[PDB]
Design a protein around this ligand. Structure first.
Ligand SMILES: NC(=O)c1ccc[n+]([C@@H]2O[C@H](COP(=O)([O-])OP(=O)(O)OC[C@H]3O[C@@H](n4cnc5c(N)ncnc54)[C@H](OP(=O)(O)O)[C@@H]3O)[C@@H](O)[C@H]2O)c1
Length: 314
């Protein structure tokens, strides 16, 4: 139910995601998740709902349903705060909203830095995203000093390709290794090379968008659906489970942490019932064979950023 991180701490293999969780529904969603047994919540400043997540975490701590040490709370540093001087301030804002005094894990959300300001995606007059001239190594040094300050227990990365991870691992004077690389992963984008790489380096991998992110704002307008894939429905029927429960169990058997998002009380409960069954090795191989290198999250407005992660093979 928990994986060991390089800092000695143990991270719950199942967590609740909160991207697209409306402020008016996420407090209830998080309260319900904690009642159901969830101990790991995935957050981010850019989701614009950390205040409302924090209300839920506070209510459950006050009720003594959980101790703080039992909870594993994750947030992420947005691209407009990559400058060395802004990193502490971004972290502190998140800590306020969440009403916590430390984070368990703090991630660099994307390797790309943007111009600092009030817009999450600052645009020029041609409407292109304005980059910062910062680099990955300077932002990492700022994250390291968050640990020395006691603001966060562990630091990691998100959406880094293997060369970008390499770059941090080879940093002269590297003090804290990345604990976690959080990346998109499901049967259509299986990530076998990047997962072999990080796992060889002792970096834990967290699978985001495990259900294919059916609610992502962008179109595909209609088209491909994991929850509705008839081959994946077959594997679920055979186990008397739902296809969502199969999609969540899949990354767990590859030793990944997984963070399905739901604001629906019955689905939050359904998504928790994945510890009591086992996919066969035949099932696992079959699901891996469905890979079609299809990304939900390609950050398409930054495709010419100097640090865009998805031009490399893995
Ligand atoms: N680091 C990154 O760049 C990054 C990027 C994307 C996502 N993430 C993290 O990963 C989390 C999960 O990814 P995601 O939000 O893209 O989507 P997801 O977890 O793949 O799917 C979310 C959608 O699936 C639905 N759903 C949940 N359980 C279901 C079930 N049992 N049966 C049928 N439908 C179900 C949800 O509906 P309802 O909510 O209506 O129930 C929601 O519409 C995010 O919230 C975020 O925390 C991180």
């Amino acid at each position: 139910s928990r994986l060991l991180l390089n800092n000695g701490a143990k991270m719950p293999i199942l967590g609740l995601g909160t991207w697209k969780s409306p402020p008016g529904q996420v407090t209830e969603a998080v309260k319900v998740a904690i009642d159901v047994g969830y101990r790991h919540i995935d957050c981010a400043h850019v989701y614009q709902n950390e205040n409302e997540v924090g209300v839920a975490i506070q209510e459950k701590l006050r009720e003594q349903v959980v101790k703080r040490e039992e909870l594993f709370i994750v947030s992420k540093l947005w691209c407009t705060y990559h400058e060395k001087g802004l990193v502490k301030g971004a972290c502190q804002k998140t800590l306020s909203d969440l009403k916590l005094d430390y984070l368990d894990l703090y991630l660099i959300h994307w390797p790309t830095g943007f111009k600092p300001g009030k817009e999450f995606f600052p645009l020029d007059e041609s409407g292109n995203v304005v980059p910062s001239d910062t680099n990955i190594l300077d932002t990492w040094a700022a994250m390291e000093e968050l640990v020395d300050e006691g603001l966060v227990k562990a630091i990691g990365i998100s959406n880094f390709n293997h060369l970008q991870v390499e770059m941090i691992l080879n940093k002269p004077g590297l003090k804290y290794k990345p604990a976690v690389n959080q990346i998109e992963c499901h049967p259509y984008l299986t990530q076998e090379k990047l997962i072999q790489y990080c796992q060889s380096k002792g970096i834990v991998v967290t699978a985001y968008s495990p259900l294919g992110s059916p609610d992502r704002p962008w179109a595909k307008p209609e088209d491909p659906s994991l929850l509705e894939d008839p081959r994946i429905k077959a594997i679920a029927a055979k186990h008397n489970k739902t296809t969502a429960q199969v999609l969540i169990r899949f990354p767990m058997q590859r030793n990944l942490v997984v963070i399905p998002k739901s604001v629906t009380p019955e689905r939050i409960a359904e998504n928790f019932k994945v510890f009591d069954f086992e996919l066969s090795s035949q099932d696992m191989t079959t699901l891996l064979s469905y890979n079609r290198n299809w990304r939900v999250c390609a950050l398409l407005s930054c495709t010419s950023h100097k640090d865009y992660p998805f031009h490399e093979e893995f």
